[PDB]
Amino acid sequence: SGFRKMAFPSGKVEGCMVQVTCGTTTLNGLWLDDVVYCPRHVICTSEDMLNPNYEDLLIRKSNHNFLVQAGNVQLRVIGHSMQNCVLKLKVDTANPKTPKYKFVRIQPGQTFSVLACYNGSPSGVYQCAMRPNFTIKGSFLNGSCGSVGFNIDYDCVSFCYMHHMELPTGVHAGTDLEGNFYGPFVDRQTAQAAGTDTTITVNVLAWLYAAVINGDRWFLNRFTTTLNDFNLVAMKYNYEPLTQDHVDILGPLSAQTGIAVLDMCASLKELLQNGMNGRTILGSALLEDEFTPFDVVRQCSGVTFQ
Amino acid sequence: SGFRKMAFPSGKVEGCMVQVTCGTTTLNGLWLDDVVYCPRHVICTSEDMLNPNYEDLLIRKSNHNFLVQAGNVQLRVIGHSMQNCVLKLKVDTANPKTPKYKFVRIQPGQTFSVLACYNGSPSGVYQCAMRPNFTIKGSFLNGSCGSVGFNIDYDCVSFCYMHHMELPTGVHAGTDLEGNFYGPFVDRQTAQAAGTDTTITVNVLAWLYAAVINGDRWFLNRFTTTLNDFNLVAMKYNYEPLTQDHVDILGPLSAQTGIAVLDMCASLKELLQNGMNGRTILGSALLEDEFTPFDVVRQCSGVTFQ
Ligand SMILES: [Cl-]
């Protein structure tokens, strides 16, 4: 028993992390097969970032201007291309530690682990969610750009995020591994508006099920409610609306606990209107939305990876 | 910026995890050089655990009764010994992925990462603290015994914990890698009393410094206080007393933020007596004690490992 904000084991990703230097700027790259992926703004100086013309800056660069280091193994760049907001550096060596992997574009509310890196070396791993406004609330310092987010399914690494920017508000923005930003953000040092950040309701419900599984049931009540009545309340507190697809995803947790999804919703409704009264759930004094229904099932069933 | 409950990268530990089977029971072992370390209760049946006589049970076992699997590599046991509550299994193969490592016995209030494993395969990684009563509040299911806790300093893995038991209260107990339990616990399925769990004050202060570094300063006040007056209040709320050694450890954070340790203590005193008023600090509605002063400095400075 017990419940923890658990990240994926990072070992398969650690062996893919490299340092990328272009002139004076150094960040992290991801070395898969014979290609290194990194944020295109590795080619910018601090001044360039205010209003970069990436095609013109990249035109001034040649394969030999990029220095790629993996530990004390310098890789040779023999081709380079810009794909959206990522640079693809073709190197002469295939990464011997390349895992089975895929690139995936996740949806808001999905969770993943981040391996925070500096100078191509791993610092720490943590789990986070893609917020509904396509930001992440990370922990990143200067030099962490190119750090990656991932999931694992059995033996395959799904890369879903590359870190690019800290917004002036302290939240973080990045791209998929095809270089398309999540959200309306651009890789420019300019004021940028993130939308309203709503709470991921389907995830809150999942965590309430986790709480029940683990012996925390004080919040269970014998009211019930309808999906429309619940969404009416959710929206007042900036909670995402629940759809039938969400009810479908929660089914297995409903079955395991004997608590129907709409009954759990009525419990949530009461917590929203009346608060937690200085009580806690799974050691938390706030409702938690960084566990998906799949995360809960995974943690409560002991799934492993190879 | 940002602050996250960050675990160490787990890759160096992943390659040390093996499955250990003795008759019908299977758990995790730690393979370093040519020795496998695992909980001695791998030799017990479910019935044996109520009142095991470990010497007599072990006397019935021979090297060939233990099955050690690392992926699809079966290791041969050629010698075995019991050291306190761990079994040392001498195997015929040195682990090629043995990191630089040491065994350390940590003190209450220190933090470490746990790599939760099942059947010798990693499931997830999370960071936790040794509580003052020598328990941990983990996430462990059946079969996770032998999962290990560790820290990394540059290139060296310090193993500090092996998981052995879930107490009837849902909290977790285990040993150092010499097999000595943390706390007064025994590897027997019997009711066991953990002490009062106090809050780790030096860690709370560290996290308050982290909050300031990250822009959360609403809780700063212009009261001050003395160490004795503060400890008088701490004890009323089941907080560990602060000593001069703790004040010494916080010095660098004091210097970086310009806030003296005793001033930070007066801020804490006010939060204890008046609560947080439905406000948050670093996204939390409770005071957090699972970051040490070293963790804060490490996360706020970007330390990496090799
Ligand atoms: Cl909280």
For residues A246 and A239, what is the distance between their CA atoms, to the nearest angstrom? 14
B106 three-class SS = coil
From residue A21, give the alpha-carbon distance in Å to each of A39, A45, B248: 11, 12, 39
- Looking up residue A240, the CATH number of its domain turns out to be 1.10.1840.10
A89 three-class SS = strand
| Cross-strand pairs, A90 | A35, A79
What domain range is A215 assigned to? 201-301
Resolution of the deposited coordinates, in angstroms? 1.8
Cβ(B205)–Cβ(B183) below 8 Å: no
- Structural biology method used: X-ray
Residues in contact with B231: Cβ distance below 8 Å, sequence separation at least 6, in sequence order: B241, B242
| Cross-strand pairs, B95 | none
Go through A37-71 and write b for each residue having 16 or more CB atoms within 10 A of its CB, e for each that does not: bbbbbbbbeeebeeebebeebbeebeeeebebbbe
- Looking up residue B51, the CATH number of its domain turns out to be 2.40.10.10
Residues in contact with A99: Cβ distance below 8 Å, sequence separation at least 6, in sequence order: A12, A13, A15, A16, A155, A156, A157
For residues B113 and B108, what is the distance between their CA atoms, to the nearest angstrom? 14
Burial of B98 (0-12, 13-18, 19+ CB in 10 A): middle
From residue B271, give the alpha-carbon distance in Å to each of B226, B280, B293: 16, 11, 20
Burial of B96 (0-12, 13-18, 19+ CB in 10 A): exposed
Starting from the edge strand earliest in sequence, which strands make up the sheet with B35-39, in order? B73-75, B66-70, B17-22, B25-32, B35-39, B86-91, B77-83
B123 three-class SS = strand
Tokens 């509580």 — which residue? B131
Task: Sort out which chain A residues have CB atoms less than 8 A from B14's CB and list them.
Answer: 9, 11
Among this protein's residues, is A246 annotated catalytic? no
A116 touching B, CB under 8 A? yes
B249 three-class SS = helix
From residue A70, give the alpha-carbon distance in Å to each of A21, A62, A90, A143, A163: 12, 20, 14, 16, 19
8-state DSSP, B76 = P
For residues A298 and A23, what is the distance between their CA atoms, to the nearest angstrom? 44
Active-site position among B16, B38, B41, B117:
B41
Chain B segment 34-93 residues within 8 A of A by beta carbon are: 71
Task: Give the tokens for residue A271.
Answer: 């917590």
> Rounded to a whole number, what is the distance in Å from the CA of B59 to chain A's nearest CA?
33
- CA–centroid distance, residue A225 to ligand 1 (Å): 27
Tokens 């250990």 — which residue? B20
